[PDB]
Amino acid sequence: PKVKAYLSQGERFIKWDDETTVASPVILRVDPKGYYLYWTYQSKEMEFLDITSIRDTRFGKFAKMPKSQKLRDVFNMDFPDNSFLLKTLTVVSGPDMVDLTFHNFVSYKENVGKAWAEDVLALVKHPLTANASRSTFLDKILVKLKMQLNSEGKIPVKNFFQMFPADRKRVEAALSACHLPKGKNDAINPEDFPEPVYKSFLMSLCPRPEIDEIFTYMTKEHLTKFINQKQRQVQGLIDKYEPSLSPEGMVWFLCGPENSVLAQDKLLLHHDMTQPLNHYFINSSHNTYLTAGQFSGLSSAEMYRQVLLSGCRCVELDCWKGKPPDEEPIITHGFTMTTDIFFKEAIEAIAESAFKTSPYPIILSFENHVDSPRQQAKMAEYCRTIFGDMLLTEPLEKFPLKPGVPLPSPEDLRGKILIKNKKNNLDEEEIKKMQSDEGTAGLEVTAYEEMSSLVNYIQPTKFVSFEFSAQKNRSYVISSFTELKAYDLLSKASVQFVDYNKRQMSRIYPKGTRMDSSNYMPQMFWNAGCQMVALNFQTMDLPMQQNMAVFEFNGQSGYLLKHEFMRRPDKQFNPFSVDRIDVVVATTLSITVISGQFLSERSVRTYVEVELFGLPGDPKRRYRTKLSPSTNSINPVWKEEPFVFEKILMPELASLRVAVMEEGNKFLGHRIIPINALNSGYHHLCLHSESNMPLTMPALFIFLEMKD
Ligand SMILES: [Ca+2]
């Protein structure tokens, strides 16, 4: 995705901060490679923001507004017919959904911020941007080093120490090996640090003798043999990667884009999007308005923006009456100490962000406690007016709400918002039981005409039995279960649950005892064909690590087509009891964890954990490498046998977790990858954060092999 020329040429803005009240003129740019959004002050200083760190961009009325009187005067915000809203730009960045930074800009020229917002987000959100080769992430480092210059236009040696902080002596030695100065207060001409010199620097700092071991120099014939035998035109690869094929040439080849750990086409939108809505796994958030714990902490409408921007397609609104003297509907976790937001604010947030990154339909799960015709009427009017044409207010002509009629497809409902709401306890012991399980979901109130009229394809009803649901044969009825109730059902009525999910929707949500907003592991519910397995997006624990990872695929649309046997009515499937037909494309996966590079910002021992998520009958062994030989985190090499996952039964449903840890089990980076997206051979596995964001420094070198 090429960086448009105007972005690299730059535009004039005033950058402002509310906490400091400082407003400074800047030129804003994206570098030609699209690694950094950066701004340059009049005094020549620069600040950089990784493109991969950007979560959203906002223009006009959606941008952040200056709150201090000092800044309001500067921007003439107390004036009739001012052009301030034609000048505002906000860039939102952060390592997860909650820890957000707002970078705020006001353009000198009118209207330019719209293009900046749209084009920058397009670069950030392209499924391939985060999935570049190891070489690209290494290049990102080089570009930073060469752009962050001192007063004399030179690279301070201290910037090398900051970039590679684990071992100063080794950095000094690598600079010296390149005939560059290594003095603490020395500086380097950027002209003396082109790509080949950078490569030499890396080879000195981070030697790769484990790659030299594959040479058992290469010619055309020998390298062709390697590519055809191990990795599952050759002279052109030598010309591209050989510095003078040498060991170093092989290093760069193996770090290059010709070698991809993923079948990258699978990151793009590519699933059949024309099947009934309930034939997909749907990315789903629980108690979306909460930023932290379930019992206390801030509620924020910003959570709706954040989850929707990551392709979440099902969110939750817990609606309550205003607290007298207030008479305006609010969103909060009832009977707790969580803060309140206005219902209106949530609708405004959803309307803004709903289709920015995915065009496919969203479902709003209302948990309604507003036992007021007036306040329900306000709720319904907010939805109708703010969502406008986005709101699905009536069923589609092709899909009437009658027995035997399937749900419409994601494609049939492109750009539509669907409302899930009802459509037309007392003592200490009972309270405790409810709090431990369904929580406030056990306390919903009757819907009146205004709210009822908005409900069509997602009608919640009390579950009776799978037999009863099958008899009634209504695809437009949804059943919701706590993790506890659904576990009881999937354990005791597995086949019936899968069959239910071929016709109707189920939504799963965390039990009430999880007051710290911990998550349950989603796999067992996906295994039963459950579509909306709702998790707390503010908690990037293992469940969310998996959720973010698997939903990155299919364009981060928030929809993944379920396995054929979870869809077609003529093949009964039981995830606990596979048959001959189920296992037709079973595979055995071997992964060898060979070595790691720049794994930590400090010298500490490290190890790698590997496991598989999948069916009950899938291989359950969890592997760990030994600790690294020493506290060397620059280039540890392990001496491990392949980790074998024998008979992955239905690879489409399985994912491989590879997680890198410091001694003590402190997270450094990970990947969770659907089995069918993996390429075989020697690869440099670039590591992601808990929230699946690409990390620049750390990588693993691995060998993958798959057999029938
Ligand atoms: Ca709720």
Swiss-Prot record:
Q: Where does Ca(2+) bind?
A: 287, 316, 318, 367
UniProt domain C2: residue ranges: 567-695
* Positions of the PI-PLC X-box domain: 271-422
GO MF term list: calcium ion binding; G-protein beta/gamma-subunit complex binding; phosphatidylinositol-4,5-bisphosphate phospholipase C activity; phospholipase C activity; phospholipid binding
Its EC number is 3.1.4.11
Top-level taxon of origin: Eukaryota
- Name of the protein in question: 1-phosphatidylinositol 4,5-bisphosphate phosphodiesterase beta-2
Key words of the record: Calcium, Coiled coil, Hydrolase, Lipid degradation, Lipid metabolism, Metal-binding, Phosphoprotein, Transducer
Disulfide linkage: none
Catalytic activity of the protein: a 1,2-diacyl-sn-glycero-3-phospho-(1D-myo-inositol-4,5-bisphosphate) + H2O = 1D-myo-inositol 1,4,5-trisphosphate + a 1,2-diacyl-sn-glycerol + H(+); a 1,2-diacyl-sn-glycero-3-phospho-(1D-myo-inositol) + H2O = 1D-myo-inositol 1-phosphate + a 1,2-diacyl-sn-glycerol + H(+)
Its lineage reads: Eukaryota, Metazoa, Chordata, Craniata, Vertebrata
The broad enzyme category this protein falls into is hydrolase
Q: Which GO terms describe its biological process?
A: detection of chemical stimulus involved in sensory perception of bitter taste; G protein-coupled receptor signaling pathway; lipid catabolic process; phosphatidylinositol metabolic process; phosphatidylinositol-mediated signaling; phospholipase C-activating G protein-coupled receptor signaling pathway; phospholipid metabolic process; release of sequestered calcium ion into cytosol
Summarize the subunit comment. Interacts with RAC1. Forms a complex composed of at least WDR26, a G-beta:gamma unit, and PLCB2.
Record function comment: The production of the second messenger molecules diacylglycerol (DAG) and inositol 1,4,5-trisphosphate (IP3) is mediated by activated phosphatidylinositol-specific phospholipase C enzymes. In neutrophils, participates in a phospholipase C-activating N-formyl peptide-activated GPCR (G protein-coupled receptor) signaling pathway by promoting RASGRP4 activation by DAG, to promote neutrophil functional responses.
Residue intervals of the PI-PLC Y-box domain: 451-567
Q: Which cofactor does it need?
A: Ca(2+)
Q: Name one GO cellular component term.
A: neuronal dense core vesicle
- Quote the catalytic residue positions: 286, 333
- Secretion signal, residue range per the UniProt entry: none
The record's misc note reads: The receptor-mediated activation of PLC-beta-2 is most effectively mediated by one G-protein alpha subunit, alpha-16.
> Any binding details for the cofactor?
Binds 1 Ca(2+) ion per subunit.
